[PDB]
Curated annotation (Swiss-Prot):
Residues 1-47 are cytoplasmic. Heterodimer of an alpha and a beta subunit. Beta-3 (ITGB3) associates with either alpha-IIb (ITGA2B) or alpha-V (ITGAV). Isoform Beta-3C interacts with FLNB. Interacts with COMP. Interacts with PDIA6 following platelet stimulation. Interacts with SYK; upon activation by ITGB3 promotes platelet adhesion. Interacts with MYO10. Interacts with DAB2. Interacts with FERMT2. Interacts with EMP2; regulates the levels of the heterodimer ITGA5:ITGB3 integrin expression on the plasma membrane. Integrin ITGAV:ITGB3 interacts with FBLN5 (via N-terminus). ITGAV:ITGB3 interacts with CCN3. (Microbial infection) Integrin ITGAV:ITGB3 interacts with herpes virus 8/HHV-8 glycoprotein B. The gene is ITGB3. It comes from Homo sapiens. Integrin alpha-V/beta-3 (ITGAV:ITGB3) is a receptor for cytotactin, fibronectin, laminin, matrix metalloproteinase-2, osteopontin, osteomodulin, prothrombin, thrombospondin, vitronectin and von Willebrand factor. Integrin alpha-IIb/beta-3 (ITGA2B:ITGB3) is a receptor for fibronectin, fibrinogen, plasminogen, prothrombin, thrombospondin and vitronectin. Integrins alpha-IIb/beta-3 and alpha-V/beta-3 recognize the sequence R-G-D in a wide array of ligands. Integrin alpha-IIb/beta-3 recognizes the sequence H-H-L-G-G-G-A-K-Q-A-G-D-V in fibrinogen gamma chain. Isoform beta-3A and isoform beta-3C are widely expressed. Isoform beta-3A is specifically expressed in osteoblast cells; isoform beta-3C is specifically expressed in prostate and testis. It is linked to Glanzmann thrombasthenia 2: A form of Glanzmann thrombasthenia, a disorder characterized by failure of platelet aggregation, absent or diminished clot retraction, and mucocutaneous bleeding of mild-to-moderate severity. Glanzmann thrombasthenia has been classified into clinical types I and II. In type I, platelets show absence of glycoprotein IIb-IIIa complexes at their surface and lack fibrinogen and clot retraction capability. Bleeding disorder, platelet-type, 24: An autosomal dominant disorder of platelet production characterized by congenital macrothrombocytopenia and platelet anisocytosis. Affected individuals may have no or only mildly increased bleeding tendency. The VWFA domain (or beta I domain) contains three cation-binding sites: the ligand-associated metal ion-binding site (LIMBS or SyMBS), the metal ion-dependent adhesion site (MIDAS), and the adjacent MIDAS site (ADMIDAS). This domain is also part of the ligand-binding site. This is Integrin beta-3. A motif (LIR) lies at residues 36-42.
Amino acid sequence: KLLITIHDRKEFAKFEEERARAKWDTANNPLYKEATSTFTNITYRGT
């Protein structure tokens, strides 16, 4: 798990830039919820 955790947390360590709150918040501002919306934020155009 040691490297499997370091060699993988890279993504987390990367996605951190978006919700980097998951280390001292995760939920704080809806941002954390917006980081996921970043997916729908491209379809949120309702069209």
